[PDB]
Design an enzyme around this catalytic site. Structure first.
Site: not given
Ligand SMILES: Cc1cc2nc3c(=O)[nH]c(=O)nc-3n(C[C@H](O)[C@H](O)[C@H](O)COP(=O)(O)O)c2cc1C
Length: 378
Positions: A27-28, A61, A200, A336
């Protein structure tokens, strides 16, 4: 009797045993410095240590190419300054008994033009000061959000340059390798996750909409050649640090950043068979589309074509995760948004406690607000 007993079971993953199968997705959060991409040590340390009951944390990331920023203030893993602060964050997670892998990213065509293009094109870095991708096709109909923009207001994605095969082989791949060595050997991460998802650089080579290359080993014209960059990066990293410390993330149906493929089933199954011989710690995938358009049973595709550890993600609750583990469809599930909002997510699963609600409007404040202020359950 336990509420989610399969979800809470330990799991052998690479050279480790996870305490449970509740995985913190990458999570960025933008809690690093703008100039040097150095983790904001104490802020990130608190955040990750507070979530260290997770079976595995996949850290956000993290940049492998100097100054190639997609999120303005994301961390890097290319400099000594970055390594030292990461080391302290990782130490805190380990003190809690946790495990942590670092996600390695190259933003590709999602680089911020106002930052990258103002970098000097000189000296020991032929990739500097340039927007780089599989093909010269910009992200369309999606602005750079205000929270990633150099100016703090919406900006426009740029037209990238088409990387030469030379630049891919001799420039891009070695950066991933060095980043992995830095993360594991020097900062003490338990492993790295290759970011092959979400539009990406690696995903941009992987899927049809973004890879229109007509020649070379990374051509867009066949499934195998579109899989090749992900394979080559992953293999090179495995050779450097051990495959039992390497995971890969993909998102075959996720439409963010103008990503779409005409045959995601065949693409996914081919990649699974191609990476099988690498003996990765795990394969991590988004099972669907955040845009709610592209459909397909990714869980079934991966299960039928990949014999290794399978981590699924996207819109799971505890019950569904528990059930898919029970049914042998997945080995673990990454969460996430629930981890953003629930530092003690694992404990809430153990007790079947209610969950905190995330506040999406505060995901990227760069302060404690919406970051370190979600409480544990009373
Ligand atoms: C604020 C935010 C930042 C995220 N940053 C990344 C990241 O850096 N790398 C990545 O592969 N996915 C990133 N994601 C996607 C999440 O890893 C995840 O796949 C997404 O939140 C869906 O899962 P969930 O339904 O459990 O939230 C991010 C999602 C959110 C909401």
């Amino acid at each position: 009797m336990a509420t989610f007993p399969e979800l809470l079971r330990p799991l052998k993953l690479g050279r480790y045993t996870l305490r449970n199968r509740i995985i913190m997705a990458p999570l960025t959060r933008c809690q690093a410095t703008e100039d040097g991409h150095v983790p904001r040590t104490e802020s990130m340390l608190k955040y990750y240590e507070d979530r260290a009951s997770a079976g595995l944390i996949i850290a956000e990331a993290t940049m492998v190419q100097p100054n190639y920023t997609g999120f303005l203030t994301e961390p890097g893993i290319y400099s000594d300054a970055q390594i030292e602060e990461w080391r302290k964050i990782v130490d805190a997670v380990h003190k809690k008994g946790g495990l942590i892998f670092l996600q390695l990213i190259h933003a590709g065509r999602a680089g911020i033009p106002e930052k990258i293009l103002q970098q000097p094109k000189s000296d020991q870095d032929p990739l500097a000061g340039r927007l780089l991708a599989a093909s010269a096709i910009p992200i369309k109909d999606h602005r750079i959000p205000a929270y990633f923009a150099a100016s703090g207001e919406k900006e426009t994605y740029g037209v990238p340059e088409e990387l030469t095969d030379d630049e891919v082989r001799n420039g891009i791949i070695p950066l991933f390798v060095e980043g992995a060595k830095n993360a594991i050997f020097k900062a003490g991460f338990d492993g790295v996750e290759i970011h092959g998802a979400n539009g990406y650089l690696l995903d941009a080579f992987f899927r049809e909409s973004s890879n229109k290359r007509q020649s070379g080993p990374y051509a867009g014209t066949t499934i195998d050649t579109r899989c090749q960059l992900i394979y080559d990066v992953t293999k090179s990293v495995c050779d450097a640090v051990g495959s039992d410390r390497v995971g890969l993330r993909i998102s075959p149906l996720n439409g963010v950043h103008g990503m779409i493929d005409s045959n995601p089933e065949a693409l996914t199954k081919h990649l699974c068979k191609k990476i099988e011989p690498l003996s990765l710690a795990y394969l991590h995938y988004l099972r669907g589309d955040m845009v709610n358009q592209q459909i397909g049973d990714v869980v079934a595709w991966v299960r039928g074509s990949y014999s290794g550890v399978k981590i699924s993600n996207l819109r799971y609750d505890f019950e569904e995760a528990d059930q898919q583990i029970r049914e042998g469809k997945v080995d673990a599930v990454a969460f996430g948004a629930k981890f953003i909002a629930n530092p003690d997510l694992v404990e809430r699963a153990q007790h079947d406690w209610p969950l905190n609600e995330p506040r999406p409007e505060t995901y990227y404040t760069r302060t404690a607000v919406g970051y370190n202020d979600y409480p544990t359950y009373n």
